[PDB]
Amino acid sequence: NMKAFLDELKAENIKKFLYNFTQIPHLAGTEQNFQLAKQIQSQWKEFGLDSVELAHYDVLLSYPNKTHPNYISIINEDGNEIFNTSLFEPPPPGYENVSDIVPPFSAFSPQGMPEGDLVYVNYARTEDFFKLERDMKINCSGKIVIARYGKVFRGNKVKNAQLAGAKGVILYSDPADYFAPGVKSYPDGWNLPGGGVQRGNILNLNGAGDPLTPGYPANEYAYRRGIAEAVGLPSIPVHPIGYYDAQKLLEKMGGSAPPDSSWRGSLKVPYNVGPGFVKMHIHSTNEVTRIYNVIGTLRGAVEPDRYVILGGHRDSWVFGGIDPQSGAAVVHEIVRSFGTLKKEGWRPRRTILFASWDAEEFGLLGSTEWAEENSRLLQERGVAYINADSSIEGNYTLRVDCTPLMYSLVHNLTKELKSPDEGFEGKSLYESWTKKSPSPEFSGMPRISKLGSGNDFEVFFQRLGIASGRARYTKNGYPLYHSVYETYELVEKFYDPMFKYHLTVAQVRGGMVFELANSIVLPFDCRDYAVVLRKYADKIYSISMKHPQEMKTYSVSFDSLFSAVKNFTEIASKFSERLQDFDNPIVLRMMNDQLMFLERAFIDPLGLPDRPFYRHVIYAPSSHNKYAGESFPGIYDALFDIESKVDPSKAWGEVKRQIYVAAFTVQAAAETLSEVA
Amino acid sequence: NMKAFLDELKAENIKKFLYNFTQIPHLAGTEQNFQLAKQIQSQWKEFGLDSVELAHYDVLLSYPNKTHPNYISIINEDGNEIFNTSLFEPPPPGYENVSDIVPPFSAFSPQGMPEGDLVYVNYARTEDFFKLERDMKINCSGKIVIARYGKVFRGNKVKNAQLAGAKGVILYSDPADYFAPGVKSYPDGWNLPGGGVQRGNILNLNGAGDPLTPGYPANEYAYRRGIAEAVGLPSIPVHPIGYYDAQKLLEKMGGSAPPDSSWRGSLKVPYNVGPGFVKMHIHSTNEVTRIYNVIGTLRGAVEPDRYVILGGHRDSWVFGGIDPQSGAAVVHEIVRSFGTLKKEGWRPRRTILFASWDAEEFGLLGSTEWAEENSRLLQERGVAYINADSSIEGNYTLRVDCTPLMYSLVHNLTKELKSPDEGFEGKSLYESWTKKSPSPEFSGMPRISKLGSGNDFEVFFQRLGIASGRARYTKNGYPLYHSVYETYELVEKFYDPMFKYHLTVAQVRGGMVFELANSIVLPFDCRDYAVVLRKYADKIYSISMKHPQEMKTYSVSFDSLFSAVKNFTEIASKFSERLQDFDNPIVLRMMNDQLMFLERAFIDPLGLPDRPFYRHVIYAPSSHNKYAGESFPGIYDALFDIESKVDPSKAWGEVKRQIYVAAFTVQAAAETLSEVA
Ligand SMILES: *[C@@H]1O[C@H](CO)[C@@H](O[C@@H]2O[C@H](CO)[C@@H](O[C@@H]3O[C@H](CO)[C@@H](O)[C@H](O)[C@@H]3O)[C@H](O)[C@H]2NC(C)=O)[C@H](O)[C@H]1NC(C)=O
Ligand SMILES: *[C@@H]1O[C@H](CO)[C@@H](O[C@@H]2O[C@H](CO)[C@@H](O[C@@H]3O[C@H](CO)[C@@H](O)[C@H](O)[C@@H]3O)[C@H](O)[C@H]2NC(C)=O)[C@H](O)[C@H]1NC(C)=O
Ligand SMILES: *[C@@H]1O[C@H](CO)[C@@H](O[C@@H]2O[C@H](CO)[C@@H](O)[C@H](O)[C@H]2NC(C)=O)[C@H](O)[C@H]1NC(C)=O
Ligand SMILES: *[C@@H]1O[C@H](CO)[C@@H](O[C@@H]2O[C@H](CO)[C@@H](O)[C@H](O)[C@H]2NC(C)=O)[C@H](O)[C@H]1NC(C)=O
Ligand SMILES: *[C@@H]1O[C@H](CO)[C@@H](O[C@@H]2O[C@H](CO)[C@@H](O)[C@H](O)[C@H]2NC(C)=O)[C@H](O)[C@H]1NC(C)=O
Ligand SMILES: *[C@@H]1O[C@H](CO)[C@@H](O[C@@H]2O[C@H](CO)[C@@H](O)[C@H](O)[C@H]2NC(C)=O)[C@H](O)[C@H]1NC(C)=O
Ligand SMILES: *[C@@H]1O[C@H](CO)[C@@H](O)[C@H](O)[C@H]1NC(C)=O
Ligand SMILES: *[C@@H]1O[C@H](CO)[C@@H](O)[C@H](O)[C@H]1NC(C)=O
Ligand SMILES: *[C@@H]1O[C@H](CO)[C@@H](O)[C@H](O)[C@H]1NC(C)=O
Ligand SMILES: *[C@@H]1O[C@H](CO)[C@@H](O)[C@H](O)[C@H]1NC(C)=O
Ligand SMILES: [Ca+2]
Ligand SMILES: [Ca+2]
Ligand SMILES: [Cl-]
Ligand SMILES: [Cl-]
Ligand SMILES: [Zn+2]
Ligand SMILES: [Zn+2]
Ligand SMILES: [Zn+2]
Ligand SMILES: [Zn+2]
């Protein structure tokens, strides 16, 4: 039983595994990450899994030239290089003989050497570009931003720079965003030093996976596009720097002043938007490189053709002390603990798949390619996907993002768990979590957020429509994210010395997987979807109601969507009444298939407009505001900035079309829960 | 049991129903076709079905103006109208007071009145246009074809006329194709009179359904495209005529002579290709019009969430004596006969749905819109679709088109059936059928053809991947197709006076539905798919091998596809070994779900290139040669006329890409039949 599974999970094992995974870099495509997969594969066999295989793919990765390094430069009238930005970050104490620490870089930047003049675009948001462009008539055709990391995914920032004429992008981490007041820089606290740099890719893949093989696995015989026709590649060069090097670049800045205090950071500098009072040197290659996923299987006893997936990435930028090895060490113990039960002759009712994804930091490629190869199995047999990236990004409370179908599983599960929090000894995890992080949407309940994008759950949820969730410990990003300073020491000393937060996360993830793989009726409550569908309908109605005149002229009705939502509510009601009153494997299967296929019902096979790989009509990143935008993304995007569009009847036509699509889809989902005949 | 079901089917009932359905026209969108649906709905209730509902949709139909009629004209230098083509066909004996016989027309032709000069393009094929264009340097920018009906679907002919610059299309039925030697015209034989005209739509929908709502059901709140953005509408006017009126138009024809005897018909005329030695008058409107499908349900006893569908259209051009009421009368008796068993307390193991589709003659709209609304139910619960259009187009033997998954069901089923043929009394239907129509592909077995397109099975098979078949009696089209002369009398006197062919077809369709709805293991044999996948791979390899040089230069390998096919063969083998050795409802369900989802595995969610609604990678009409082209249509189309392409490496790149897509898909389908964990 469940208590058995949980009591076998130990914090010391997690510590032991974390240390084991974090002593060298495990960058996607390198021999070191191959050896770590081989090790995971042995260990998962030893732990008891029925099978453990490597699944490999040949995907487009990106690396800096080991002999013509990347850097930015200040240049005078006569073309001399005054300031040079750092080539490496200062390694942390005791890691000076680290072999193969890849230097800071923006994965997938084209090579270039553009000269030109700075322009500070704040966070390089849509909002921020509407500030320069719309109000202050600033124009960047030929100019170079400079932008601070934060708020939005970094690929949107480069996309936004592209759209707006820019010819280079410089990315830096400002202390306002990544320097917690009152705590010391690493190694003496958990803050970002001035020499630290956030790595990361700057792709805009919109769920496509490997840029060369959209739709199909990058296997041994795959036909690859040319780099010219590739999906999501930037056209302008990009490089990240720490705040010491950004000081130098930003201090001599002139032109217009900042519009307000929200456009100024905490460096002792004017934060002058420019233009004028820079030369980039990049040099990174793209190359097809083999990646390795590890897939463990624990065959179910009664329903072996029904899959519950616990999955997380293994690849790191450098040591990945938090991101992802704090997740992977939790997955390792969970596997050990399941295999322990298995060894005592137990099996789960459904099959559990365990995955160690590769090349996640390069655009979710391991998970995506694997899903593309097995989409047929996943879509007819996939019960649920629990992600397992970073277990901690803080030590305050639990963060859960999941489909509404899993709200009660998560509420119930955490009432049976002991809080690890200071001043909540004896109290439950439900208790601490809901005291520390209450629901804004009412009432005496914890906040659970929407699943968005940008981790490995993406392909499962947003393309395939498999019910997904994630859980981790969070703050009230985290400063050392994607720098060399992200180490085991960072976690043992400053984040979780007992490893009690790690263990709590393991119990939430492990217990979710347990409940999903073992409970006789799937632990989904479709009435929860009904409740949020109403909220989301109200929300989107409100955004439209900021244009009352246009709604009258073009006859923009939301009646169909509210009608669909009401029907969903009634049918889901009648359906849960039936789920309680019934005995008989076939009736059981049928009702579970209905529960399982419900999330699937929200997938439109045509996808969203210009994003064929985002097929979920309810959730699914907005094309503009990515995780930051709203649900019913098709309607939200049709409405976004609609007052600016040239042909209003055409633009309002498309709002109506998206109302239709959403209403139809909600009604169709509902009807999967009607009696079957 | 089955013999019970079959013995209850009676020929007299079929006769009785056919007469009942054929006394007035039942054109899509008219009150008469509404009343016929209401009647079917009552009767299906009376017969015993658990439910029978109307499902309606508002779709784009097309009608001639009842007061400004359509016609073609010959015109002199001074603009006078010498020859006028007929306004109606001469009604058959006893039907002179037929109310609301719609006159001959080409459904969905735009209105126009173009003047210009004839050009005879034979059957207006791709092949035939390569004759004029490539060899004889004939050029039609501004000219009017004239073309004979035959060989290809009539919409391809108008598409081909469009592509080639033409400004009108005239369609006529030549006696060479529609006049069987030695038999008299209707009413004294079954031949086409000179006054008879083939109606039909000329859409190129490529599976889209309602031209205004591609992807989504045309329901009460649907957003409709503008006619300008509509899918598959022709741009040039089109009108059909009988051969008496075509004589007049073709006799004064000059310019170049016919290239051979395959370009000349059997009218006493030169068959001069033109140009020169005509004015069209059209006038038809398009309008959104309500259609009504009738859906009957016979709830299954053990697996009510698994659907077997028997479906056929009800709408006719005029009386529909063969097309479709000879099908629908068979469906009616089948339903009666199932409901009879039901009334004696029996139920099928799986649910059976019975459908009377509407607006099929207007581009498969009833079936398609219904499938678009219920795609989610169909794709997870759909076992099989048996079509039920025209039961007879001849009286020689059985024609069966079906997925390879149904070969053995059909072989087995016909060995248990009595042949209705002259000189085969006592012998089985398998016996007559295979003597009369042997397999070319070896050996002592009957020919079974590929399912193509152009009837209501299309959306189920080609878009949704639901295993489908059809069966009918055929000749060694049929002359009166889509004319007013297609009557009950045509069938009772000349085609099937006993109604013994009708009854044989009812037993084949009914017994297929019976076996599929009742057998404990689904009656699919996946090894049959393995066999034809090899044939299809060999075939497509051969077409490519006509370009050996280019295969060397661009490294065009079919290794991946043969490898995929071999794996399919091995896995399907191992899978049938398991299907025989096993006991336990859950294991039964699982193995059936594997069998059921196998056809589904051949669906690519991205569709074929520029045809998003044809998603089956194996079958599925070619973009060029439609039912006439080959399997692996994506590869076939990439290769078609490839020597003419401007950029050979780009064109050969796309052949390779389609090899990849096909190989991947075959491998992925196979793997659904591997052990599940
Ligand atoms: C939510 O569920 C209800 C069913 O409880 C759906 O109501 C349906 O609404 C349409 C009108 O929007 C009705 O259409 C009407 O059909 C009659 C013939 O039946 C026709 O003569 C009228 O002109 C009209 O077109 C439909 O029958 C009605 N069904 C009911 C009330 O039982 C509603 O559409 C559902 N919402 C969505 C978004 O699907
Ligand atoms: C049909 O099934 C067979 C399996 O029986 C598939 O064979 C597989 O073929 C590829 C090469 O095309 C092998 O890849 C190799 O992997 C090794 C590591 O395992 C690597 O070091 C090599 O460089 C190479 O990339 C694969 O392992 C092999 N599996 C076998 C023989 O067991 C074949 O691909 C299937 N056909 C299709 C179209 O899927
Ligand atoms: C992480 O732990 C594993 C195993 O617990 C270590 O791998 C083993 O190392 C010993 C000593 O070299 C060998 O006997 C085995 O060959 C290894 N087993 C494997 C690879 O599965 C591994 O070295 C540890 N890593 C670190 C850096 O401490
Ligand atoms: C979470 O727990 C609640 C309360 O225990 C469960 O809801 C009850 O479920 C039982 C068992 O089927 C019913 O008999 C009760 O009537 C339910 N009570 C309420 C308040 O609804 C709920 O099923 C659990 N959710 C899960 C496991 O998904
Ligand atoms: C086809 O058969 C049906 C019923 O067997 C006939 O419909 C019935 O006609 C009688 C006489 O008008 C009425 O009592 C009923 O109202 C009808 N029932 C219905 C519509 O379900 C129908 O008229 C026949 N059609 C023809 C042309 O013979
Ligand atoms: C069609 O009939 C053949 C021959 O009767 C069936 O094949 C046999 O099926 C039985 C029953 O499971 C097996 O024990 C035999 O070994 C099979 N014989 C052969 C020659 O394969 C076949 O299953 C039937 N096909 C259907 C109903 O789909
Ligand atoms: C920056 O790098 C270049 C290339 O090595 C060099 O010429 C230049 O002087 C450098 N600047 C400094 C301060 O070293
Ligand atoms: C861990 O816990 C203490 C308790 O408040 C807190 O002060 C400290 O900020 C936490 N560490 C991190 C990295 O957030
Ligand atoms: C053809 O129809 C037009 C329109 O009614 C008429 O003017 C013309 O003379 C007709 N030709 C004949 C032969 O009646
Ligand atoms: C029906 O049967 C006879 C037998 O050969 C044949 O001569 C006649 O052509 C058939 N009728 C039709 C319409 O094919
Ligand atoms: Ca791919
Ligand atoms: Ca439609
Ligand atoms: Cl996570
Ligand atoms: Cl048919
Ligand atoms: Zn991560
Ligand atoms: Zn990361
Ligand atoms: Zn028909
Ligand atoms: Zn027809």
Rounded Cα–Cα distance for residues A349 and A346 (Å): 10
Rounded Cα–Cα distance for residues A603 and A462 (Å): 8
From B427, B636, B417, select the one nearest B544 (Cα to Cα): B636
Q: Both B135 and B271 in a single domain? A: yes
Rounded Cα–Cα distance for residues B319 and A608 (Å): 44
Q: Both B89 and B233 in a single domain? A: yes
Q: Both A497 and A514 in a single domain? A: yes
In this structure, which amino acid lies at residue B75? Answer: I
CB B242, CB B193: distance < 8 Å:
yes
Q: Distance of alpha carbon A177 from its chain centroid, rounded? A: 19
- Residue after which a domain boundary falls, among B282, B310, B338: B282
Q: Both A231 and A82 in a single domain? A: yes
Q: Both A43 and A175 in a single domain? A: no
Q: Which of B84, B85, B87, B282 to mutate to test the pocket of ligand 9 (most atoms within 8 A of CB)?
A: B84
Rounded Cα–Cα distance for residues A579 and A583 (Å): 10
Spell out the residues 6+ positions from residue A204 whose beta carbon is closer than 8 angstroms to its own.
Answer: A155, A156, A158, A159, A232, A234
Q: Both B146 and B238 in a single domain? A: yes
Resolution, Å (one decimal): 2.4
Cis peptide before A275 (omega within 30 of 0): yes
Instruction: Please state whether beta strands A303-313 and A350-357 pair in parallel, antiparallel, or not at all (unpaired).
Output: parallel
Q: Both B567 and B467 in a single domain? A: no
Domain containing A99: what range? 65-282
Q: What CATH code is carried by the domain that includes residue B596? A: 1.20.930.40
Q: Both B500 and B594 in a single domain? A: no
Question: Does the annotation count B360 as an active-site position?
Answer: yes
CB B671, CB B578: distance < 8 Å:
no
Tell me which residue has tokens 């059981």: A588
Taking CA atoms only, the protein residue closest to ligand 5 atom 27 is: B20
Dist. CA B393 → ligand 2 center (Å): 50
Spell out the residues 6+ positions from residue B577 whose beta carbon is closer than 8 angstroms to its own.
Answer: none
Q: Cβ–Cβ of A606/B585 closer than 8 Å?
A: no
Rounded Cα–Cα distance for residues A339 and A296 (Å): 11
* Dihedral, B403, B407, B413, B419 alpha carbons, nearest 10: 100
- Residue after which a domain boundary falls, among A471, A493, A523: A523
**Domains: count for chain A:** 3
A559-580 vs A648-672: helix crossing angle, rounded to 10:
10
Helix, strand or coil, per DSSP, at residue B516: helix
Catalytic residue, chosen from B128, B333, B358, B360, is B360
Dist. CA A180 → ligand 8 center (Å): 11
Q: Both A267 and A368 in a single domain? A: no
CA dihedral for B392, B395, B398, B402, sign (positive or negative): negative
Instruction: Please state whether beta strands A147-148 and A200-201 pair in parallel, antiparallel, or not at all (unpaired).
Output: unpaired
- Residue after which a domain boundary falls, among A490, A523, A556: A523
Q: What CATH code is carried by the domain that includes residue A501? A: 3.40.630.10
Q: Which residues of B touch A216 (CB under 8 A)?
A: 660-661, 664
In this structure, which amino acid lies at residue A40? Answer: I
CA dihedral for A627, A630, A632, A633, sign (positive or negative): negative
Cis peptide before A519 (omega within 30 of 0): no
B489 is in an annotated binding site: no
| Break positions in chain B: residue before each gap, C to N over 2.5 angstroms | 277, 476, 583
- In chain A, which residue's Cα lies nearest the Cα of B670? A376
Q: Both B140 and B235 in a single domain? A: yes
**Paired tokens of A24:** 């060298």
- In chain B, which residue's Cα lies nearest the Cα of A613? B606
Instruction: Please state whether beta strands A200-201 and A106-107 pair in parallel, antiparallel, or not at all (unpaired).
Output: parallel
Which DSSP state fits A644? G
Q: Both B329 and B241 in a single domain? A: no
From B433, B436, B649, B616, select the one nearest B536 (Cα to Cα): B616
Cβ-count burial of A415 within 10 angstroms (0-12 exposed, 13-18 middle, 19+ buried)? exposed
Instruction: Please state whether beta strands A147-148 and A169-172 pair in parallel, antiparallel, or not at all (unpaired).
Output: parallel
CA dihedral for B378, B380, B381, B386, sign (positive or negative): positive
Rounded Cα–Cα distance for residues B89 and A568 (Å): 53
CB B286, CB B360: distance < 8 Å:
no
Residues with CB under 6 A from ligand 5: B 20, 23, 39, 42
Ligand 10 atom closest to the Cα of residue B478 is: 13
DSSP structure string for B329-363: HHHHHHHHHHHHHHHTT---SEEEEEEEE---TTT
Q: Both B429 and B451 in a single domain? A: yes
**HSE value, Cβ hemisphere, 13 Å, CA-based, for B236:** 27
Spell out the residues 6+ positions from residue B346 whose beta carbon is closer than 8 angstroms to its own.
Answer: none
Q: Nearest CA of chain A to the CA of B157: how many Å?
A: 29
What positions of A carry a catalytic annotation? 360, 557, 593, 616
Spell out the residues 6+ positions from residue A536 whose beta carbon is closer than 8 angstroms to its own.
Answer: A618, A630, A631, A632
Q: What is the longest distance spanned by two Cα atoms in chain A?
A: 86
Task: Tell me the H-state helices in B60-139.
Answer: 126-130
Interface contact A550, partner B, CB < 8 A: no
Helix, strand or coil, per DSSP, at residue A576: helix
